[PDB]
Design a binder for this molecule. Structure first.
Ligand SMILES: Nc1ncnc2c1ncn2[C@@H]1O[C@H](COP(=O)(O)OP(=O)(O)O)[C@@H](O)[C@H]1O
Ligand SMILES: Nc1ncnc2c1ncn2[C@@H]1O[C@H](COP(=O)(O)OP(=O)(O)O)[C@@H](O)[C@H]1O
Ligand SMILES: Nc1ncnc2c1ncn2[C@@H]1O[C@H](COP(=O)(O)OP(=O)(O)O)[C@@H](O)[C@H]1O
Ligand code: BEF
Ligand code: BEF
Ligand code: BEF
Ligand SMILES: [K+]
Ligand SMILES: [K+]
Ligand SMILES: [K+]
Ligand SMILES: [Mg+2]
Ligand SMILES: [Mg+2]
Ligand SMILES: [Mg+2]
Lengths: 524, 524, 524
């Protein structure tokens, strides 16, 4: 309704103070000597986190102007997280430095939009230099290293991730869940396994109790429910009874089919089992074809001139063995030739890139893996729930970080990257003096991350930053050992993707934020 | 509703202060060295914008009177927007100037209604002088220029629009959507293509690309959803003997029909495909006749005496090719008479002037494009959502502005146009001395845009206004380069329509506003 | 609720101050040098108006008593508007004057009830003197003049109204709507105009812009809906297939009834069209016979001993041409006897009385115009919405004023009429001295309008009032030219009816208001 407006430097100060609250809150978590922030939650017990964007998201201020500022820089940490998954704190520190020096330049009466232009040019150039310094991260050693770094110097996490990426490969899927016991644990499921259980509990064939085993069985795949009665199916069972046991996959299996199926499996004339198909309906309908081509069987598609009632023993798929429990169904191997199969693993790759980003990629690469690779799950150990949350957060951080490292390569850590490219951009100049100042502002702000890392140790940022600028190559400061040295040799690695993204995102919002000559909001 | 009344100068001052708050808020965005305003939003993050009407709309003041003033002048920016789409800020600045100088004139005790009379006369003359100064904007260079100017000196956007307008021809449509990646992108679809997919994936001919290609097919156009194949059948048998494929368009095609159709296209009995009609009921039924006349077939209307069972090969439409994928359908080289096409486009032009703006103009011209011209979409690149808002806003501004240039021609930018016609009206006089004063108020106020453009650079407006008024023709001040020169030669162009509009709209509300002797509102 | 009572002068002051607030608010709009009032509105933008009653209606005051006063005198402006349509401001000023001098007289201890009697007697006499002074207003010159005057010296309005009233005659109907473009436009539809559109768009004939033309067709008139009446129809269809096209008018034509009609106009058996009947159920059936006698056709009433299926080729009416679009239908040159036309015109004349003056007259005069004469519509041009409200208000004012003048004639403007009758009543006396004082109060108050018109110019009202009171006849003051002269020759004319009304209503509420010895209201 009724508004309140402020103009010029008067508004810039309020906005800046607002930025500074969010930034000062996020800064303490930066680097190895960084400390932890506690975020209250109304419903439960509090959460303790070193994760930057988690802290940033929770910040909101009275005094609506300061709040506007904070709400604006919150976006840099949020997009940093949503793109890379690590380095949010760094992106925030960069944003703060840029806003500060930038507004300082505006106070000098320099043209703000021109400052923005200079900054953005400086950033594009710096991004080129970054993409240049990057060296591929391939061998499991380096991977374990960047893993350890994103995890705040927990070696176990890095080595565990290196192992997982080693077993299921890069293309393979890796997920992380809460662990029961205190030790971190890595579970790896190979081959075709999907998450659904047996419809009838009577099917257990083994002293394994819940589990069910079928040796070299035949697999039947149906698009439609058997939900009516057992009428249509038995013609297939008659051919299936000749030499083999049988596995069923469909939409669902109702009583009339199930009970009779049970009675026949009990004596049993032939051993049979039935489970729901893996996913939600359409995706799952797509996954039935996966199971089909994998087992060398054919899907029965109601919407074609193949009828559910008529099917022959050759229509069935074959497998070495199959195992079912309350949770998942498993095929121990496909009997179909790898030419056609790998044809389908390759052809699904055209489906891999799409407007759905990672939503499709998790379960699609899941699909690809289940056919070719494997799926992995990391159970994070902790004593208490408050340790559990933070620990798992660092783990997911390390996972994102390693994926980024693998994808875009890595550059020297400890914030030595940005300062190193900044030294290469010293001769860069713009169209006018204002733009020159903008560039110089950006180049100054790229020192921020390192100075903050040093500062969290309670040491001179000026001195360390200088003695680093005195050096060449990967020479940098090791904050944990509080000594200088070669970063790459010390195994301190920043994934290029996260440094690149953090810088890009910081400059994007700070650039716009320093062009503010007016602010409009609701009344207090 | 207990009221509160104020009279005369006592009330005029409150009104003026409010106006001054709205205007001073909008002004900072004026011109190239103009700056940005931040608008808080309850639901989301704040918005950063250089767009004038965007800032104007958000303004509301506590004091009911001041608020009445602001709420009244907000309309000039709004109408500016609804007519031109650019020049909102300018229209606001003109309104502020006229109001200020006018109320001062009332302080002299002059007759307000006569001041309005004088102002309106001066404006009426100035518009003609503008129509004289306006020169055609045709070549892609000029278009690119006005684009660049309205876009706040982003040349890329200016070139993009000129290019697009070149590719889709006149009557072709150009729209802008949020872009996925950081770079700007121009997409162009030529001819008749609508967004619907094949109903069954089994229809696919010539895979991969999951596309269906029909060479010289028959197009079937149905107003109703297709459930049974009985009603469907005769025409299909007629086409199978015909030697040709068949394309289907309806509200939808239900199971029995799809299934029968799929099985028949599979057996290799007939090559067929089916897609939904393009829009919602009135929209789709309206577009069915377009597609019909384009392909020379006749729509089967249950609501007329054609029933689907009775259908003829002549009821069918024909085309050179049709191509369908999961997303879009395309009709290539329809066989419908060029006569019929220009007939229906002409018949749509009567719908073009329809009193309901925005989407009606947008989606109607869209249809036109599909029949004759082509459609284009400009995707705006940005790192973050706030940058996306700023860039995309500037893009639609540049878009409307270029369209305005094409329609009404262009005049010298930098507001040098208004001052130039104002010098031409210097000998104008009215019926009495007061009206004479009104004219002078208008002519003095036409300097405002230029003086503000200069003022936002932090330079003497007085001096620039003088040295410009000393000159003639298109000689003006370049605010970006902060040096003088010919406006047209330096490519600073104001679309004549937005400049003409800004002035008329400003004058209409301000003229009335200075006639206020009393103000009535609710009590605090 | 708990009340609050005040007695005598203490309460009278409270009433008076409120009256004075309403009045001082309305007065500022009086005469040519009058000014404008701004009225806040919660939902939308504020409203700017010179219209008196509009300002009056919006007034309500905190203090309950002052509010009682204002709320009571608001009724004079309201009744003035509801009767005349102009002269609201004048009526208000009269009321304030009368109330003021009256309360003054009450302070002298005069019997209020006697004062009321004196006032009313003086007024009743003053009306006679007015109708004596009244001169016929006929010629388009005069019409244009009083029109222009009520419109606040906008000549275009006077000319437009004169054009319409000359074109459509007096009895003809005139309405006013918001205009598309900036310029005022007068549209005139001669002959039989019909408000409803075609039910099927396929009926379209040779014209474009979706119009249908039938040359020398037959007219069909039905009381009942045609749906299942499809089969009833053909007996008539035989003549339509024989020699000529066909037109249908009824309650409605449902689906499948319509379709058959369309198909035949397509195949080319018969050219036909169908539209809904004009009005709501009972009103409309009366207008059907009008159309019947106009075209020489006969109404078919299912609700009479006219049967639906059987009708003859001669039972139909004939016309030169008919034209239909989405909005309106038009019948050219009915073949019905002038005997029948003037017969229905004459038989409606007892109905022009219509047992009331208000609701019915509006749409009845519409019917009257449509049958013999013609209808006119004035579209009002404006740049912006706030101007549109103001312009159309003055236009509607001028329209009412012209009709009033034509019916009752005109008298000299500038409020010189009343001051002229006041001189004639100088010898008037009552029953006792108090009543005499009342008479003199009315006569004294009749000077008020002129003195206010003068006062809004910032001139001595006393001086102009005296030097005007010194002359005779139509001698008066022109406030726009600010010099004296003959009023009617200068084209300043007040319709006798509005002055007569203003005086009567003002006297009615003011006479009673001064009789107050006590006031009761709710507590704060
Ligand atoms: N032992 C270390 N010595 C020097 N720099 C380190 C060390 N460990 C991590 N860093 C640097 O600190 C940064 C880690 O920041 P962190 O606190 O994880 O928040 P974020 O990852 O969101 O920036 C990385 O850029 C990394 O290069
Ligand atoms: N470099 C420049 N030098 C001088 N005038 C300019 C320059 N760029 C734009 N202008 C003028 O400034 C005005 C820009 O309007 P803008 O500030 O974008 O808001 P709006 O278009 O809503 O008024 C136009 O008159 C344009 O001609
Ligand atoms: N040029 C003029 N000189 C003097 N009086 C005028 C002039 N024009 C109009 N008037 C008077 O002004 C009065 C009407 O003005 P206005 O207040 O706008 O409407 P109303 O009072 O009828 O509601 C009429 O009595 C008319 O005679
Ligand atoms: F504080 Be982090 F590693 F996003
Ligand atoms: F200030 Be704008 F580009 F309408
Ligand atoms: F106050 Be008005 F011109 F009816
Ligand atoms: K961290
Ligand atoms: K702008
Ligand atoms: K008035
Ligand atoms: Mg990290
Ligand atoms: Mg602009
Ligand atoms: Mg009037």
């Amino acid at each position: 309704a009724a508004k309140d407006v402020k103009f010029g430097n008067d508004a810039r100060v309020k906005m800046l103070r607002g930025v500074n609250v969010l930034a000062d809150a996020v800064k303490v978590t930066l680097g190895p000597k960084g400390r932890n922030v506690v975020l209250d939650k109304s419903f439960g017990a509090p959460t303790i986190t070193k994760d930057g964007v988690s802290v940033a998201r929770e910040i909101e201020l009275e005094d609506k102007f300061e709040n506007m500022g904070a709400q604006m820089v919150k976006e840099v940490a949020s997009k940093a997280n949503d793109a890379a998954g690590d380095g949010t704190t760094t992106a925030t520190v960069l944003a703060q430095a840029i806003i500060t020096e930038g507004l300082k330049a505006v106070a000098a009466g320099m043209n703000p939009m021109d400052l923005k232009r200079g900054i953005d040019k400086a950033v594009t150039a710096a991004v080129e230099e970054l993409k240049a310094l990057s060296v591929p991260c391939s061998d499991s050693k380096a991977i374990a290293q960047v893993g350890t770094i994103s995890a705040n110097s927990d070696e176990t996490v890095g080595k565990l991730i290196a192992e997982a990426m080693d077993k299921v490969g890069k293309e393979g899927v890796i997920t992380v869940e809460d662990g029961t016991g205190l030790q971190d644990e890595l579970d790896v499921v190979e081959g075709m396994q999907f998450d659904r259980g047996y419809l009838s509990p009577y099917f257990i064939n083994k002293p394994e109790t819940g589990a069910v085993e079928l040796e070299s069985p035949f697999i039947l795949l149906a698009d439609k429910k058997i939900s009516n009665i057992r009428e249509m199916l038995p013609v297939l069972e008659a051919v299936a009874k000749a030499g083999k046991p049988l596995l069923i996959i469909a939409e669902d299996v109702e009583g009339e089919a199930l009970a009779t199926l049970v009675v026949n499996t009990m004596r049993g004339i032939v051993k049979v089992a039935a489970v729901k198909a893996p996913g939600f309906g359409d995706r799952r309908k797509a996954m039935l074809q996966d199971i089909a081509t994998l087992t060398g069987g054919t899907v029965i598609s109601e919407e074609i001139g193949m009828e559910l009632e008529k099917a022959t023993l050759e229509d069935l798929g074959q497998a070495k063995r199959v195992v079912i429990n309350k949770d998942t169904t498993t095929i121990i191997d496909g009997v179909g030739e790898e030419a056609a199969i790998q044809g389908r693993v390759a052809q699904i790759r055209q489906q891999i890139e799409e407007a759905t980003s990672d939503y499709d990629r998790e379960k699609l690469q899941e699909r690809v893996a289940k056919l070719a690779g494997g799926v992995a799950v990391i159970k994070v150990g902790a004593a208490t729930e408050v340790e559990m949350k933070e620990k798992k957060a660092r783990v997911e951080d390390a996972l994102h970080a390693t994926r980024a490292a693998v994808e875009e390569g890595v550059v020297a850590g400890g914030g030595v990257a940005l300062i190193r490219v900044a030294s290469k951009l010293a001769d860069l100049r713009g169209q006018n003096e204002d733009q020159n100042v903008g560039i110089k502002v950006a180049l100054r702000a790229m020192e921020a991350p390192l100075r903050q890392i040093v500062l969290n140790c309670g040491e001179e940022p000026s001195v360390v930053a200088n003695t680093v600028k005195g050096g060449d190559g990967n020479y940098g400061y090791n904050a944990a050992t509080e000594e200088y040295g070669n970063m790459i040799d010390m195994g301190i690695l920043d994934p290029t993707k996260v440094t690149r993204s953090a810088l890009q995102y910081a400059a994007s919002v700070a650039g716009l934020m320093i062009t503010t000559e007016c602010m409009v909001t609701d009344l207090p």
